[PDB]
Structure formats: structure tokens, C-alpha cells
Amino acid sequence: GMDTSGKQAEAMALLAEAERKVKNSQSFFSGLFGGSSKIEEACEIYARAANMFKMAKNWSAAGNAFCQAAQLHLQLQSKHDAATCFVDAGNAFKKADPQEAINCLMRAIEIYTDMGRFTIAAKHHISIAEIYETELVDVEKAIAHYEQSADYYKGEESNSSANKCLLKVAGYAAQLEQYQKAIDIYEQVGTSAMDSPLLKYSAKDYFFKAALCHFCIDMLNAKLAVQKYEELFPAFSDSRECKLMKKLLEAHEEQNVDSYTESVKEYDSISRLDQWLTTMLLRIKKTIQ
């Protein structure tokens, strides 16, 4: 398209113009000492070139120009604008180079928390964890970022966001990490919703999950925890999950794989699986001996 090629041509022209402008800017500071306008107009040229270049469908050099302009703006003691440009460069690099985007976003996060804005820092941490885990296969760093975001949210009584982050962290831990953290977080989130204005009945699932983890540890712990939750939370007593867990435990007690298999099959037929309970149940069945 003509629009593309023209945009790239004018972008190269204006990048060369910005380079010569900054070099002449260094010359003029000593030559005439006009102050600091020269650099700020150079930064404006850089920003315009970068924006119209990312309209040219090309990203990497757009983000590079964003980073360079942000640096040449921060060297004039201006921070918030430089941090916003850092975040924009990270967004642009998201589709160009994950490492550069991550570095720029870490710089933005540190400068923001230095300013004193926690919610923005937590949002950026969540974005970092999401981009890190979606394309790069790794969790522990994602777990740490999610925990930091939850801590930042709890610092300003943002209960819902922190709850969602803790739930995700506990789920990840249960899938891979040891089950003590998962048990604690799941039980706490389940018991922090007994007086929920709108979620007065959803905690049962969480309780069930906790019980499943306990049954992952041992049968004795499984039954003790199931009882504890039964007495502590009366409603879970009449829950279908309670009957299913009792049936599964009693079947596993007598070592009859047919009963366990039929129970899980009928449960799945009655209600669809979720792809997380199925793996847990398969692991439990693997240890039936």
C-alpha cells in the first residue's frame, strides 16, 4: 500500500531529522545556550515519528523510538511522562520482543511505586505475569508477580482483586506446588465468603477443592477435614459434593476400583467436568493399588 511505504519513508526522514536535531542541540547548548527547548522539541519529533511509525504497522523500531524519547525526557528530570512512554513502549514490544517489553514495564513499575501509586504497579505486575505465562512456559516467577499484585491490592483494601489473585495462585500451587499453601488459601477464601452479599452459596466449591487437596494428602486428613468443614459450615452438609466425596472415600476405603470409576463417571455424566478436577481424580485413582 502507498500509505505504508509513505509512512515508513517519512518516518526515516523524521528520525534522521531528530538525530541531526539532537546533535545540533548539543552544539547549540554551548554555542548559544538557549536553555532546554531544543531537547524537548527533539523529543516531540521522536514521539510523533514513533506514533506514525507504529501506524506504519512496524512495531520494534516504534518501541525503540519510544524508549529513546522517554530516556531523553527523563534526563531532563521529567519522570511521569517518561514512565508513561516506557509503558507504551512495553505495550508496543509485547508483539515484538517480550524481554524488552518486560524490562520497560519493570522500569515503569519501579518508578510508579517510587511515586507512590500501588494500583497501577499491581496492574502492571499482573500484566507482566500474564504475558510471562501465556507465551513463556514458567510459573514460579508468575506466582511471585501475582502474589506481589495481591499484596499491593490488599495494601489498599481491594478485596476482590486480591481474592481473585490469591485464588489463581492457590490453583497454580495445587496443580504444581505443594498443597499446604493451596489448602490455606482455599480455606481462607472459602471462609471469607459466608456473609457475601451476592456469593452466599458459592464458597461450597472452594471448600470442596480444599477437601480434595486434603484427600490428596491422606485419607485420614481427608475425613478429618471433611468432618471439620461439615460441622463448621452446616450448608455444605446438604451439598451434592459432600455426598460424592463420602461415596468416593468409602469406595476407596475397601479397594474396589469399579465403585470409584462408576462414581466419577456418573458424576461427570450428571455434570460436566472442568479439566482440573479430572486430573486430580486420575491422580487419586493412580494410587489405589
Residues that bind its own copies (CB under 8 A): 48, 51, 54-55, 91, 94, 113, 116, 155-157, 234-235, 272
CB 51 within 8 A of CB 61: no
Q: Please choose which of another protein, its own copies, none residue 232 contacts, taking the beta carbon within 5 to 8 angstroms, the exact cut-off set by kind.
A: none
**24 near another protein, judged by CB under 8 A:** no
Q: Choose the one of its own copies, another protein, none that binds residue 234, judging by a C-beta under 5 to 8 angstroms depending on kind.
A: its own copies
Q: Is 130 in the site for another protein (CB under 8 A)?
A: no
48 binds another protein (CB under 8 A): no
Point out which span in 50-58, 94-102, 136-144, 219-227 binds another protein (CB under 8 A): 219-227
Whole-number Cα distances in Å, 283 to 103, 182, 226: 39, 17, 19
Judging by beta carbons within 10 Å of its beta carbon (0-12, 13-18, 19+), is residue 138 exposed, middle or buried? exposed
Stretch that binds another protein, among 53-61, 141-149, 155-163, 258-266 (CB under 8 A): 155-163
Nearer to its own copies, 121 or 170 (CB): 121
Q: Which does 155 bind (CB under 5 to 8 A by kind): its own copies, another protein, none?
A: its own copies
What amino acid is encoded at 150 in this protein? A
Q: Which of 236, 239, 252 is nearest to 288 (CA)?
A: 252
CB of 176 to another protein, least distance (A): 17
Q: Where are the alpha helices (DSSP H) in the chain?
A: 2-31, 37-54, 60-74, 80-93, 98-115, 118-135, 140-155, 159-175, 179-191, 203-217, 219-232, 240-254, 257-270, 277-286
Angle at CA 159, nearest 5°, toward 153 and 161?
60
* Angstrom distances, CA of residue 265 to CA of 64, 119, 248, 255: 55, 45, 12, 17
Q: Does 155 bind another protein (CB under 8 A)?
A: no
- Amino acid of residue 54: K
| Residue 220, contacted partner among its own copies, another protein, none, CB below 5-8 A by kind | another protein
Selection from its own copies, another protein, none that 37 binds (CB < 5 to 8 A by kind) is another protein
Contact 139, 172 (CB under 8 A): yes
> In the complex with its own copies, which residue's Cβ is closer, 32 or 270?
270
Q: Which residue of 48, 154, 164, 168 would you call a contact of another protein, by CB under 8 A?
A: 164
- Amino acid identity of 13? A
Cell 511522562 belongs to residue: 81
91 belongs to the binding site for another protein (CB under 8 A): no
Q: Which does 48 bind (CB under 5 to 8 A by kind): another protein, its own copies, none?
A: its own copies
- The torsion angle over the Cα atoms of residues 265, 268, 269 and 274, rounded to 10 degrees, is -150
Please report, as residue ranges, which positions from 267 to 286 form the binding site for another protein (by CB under 8 A): 270-271
Does residue 199 bind another protein (CB under 8 A)? yes
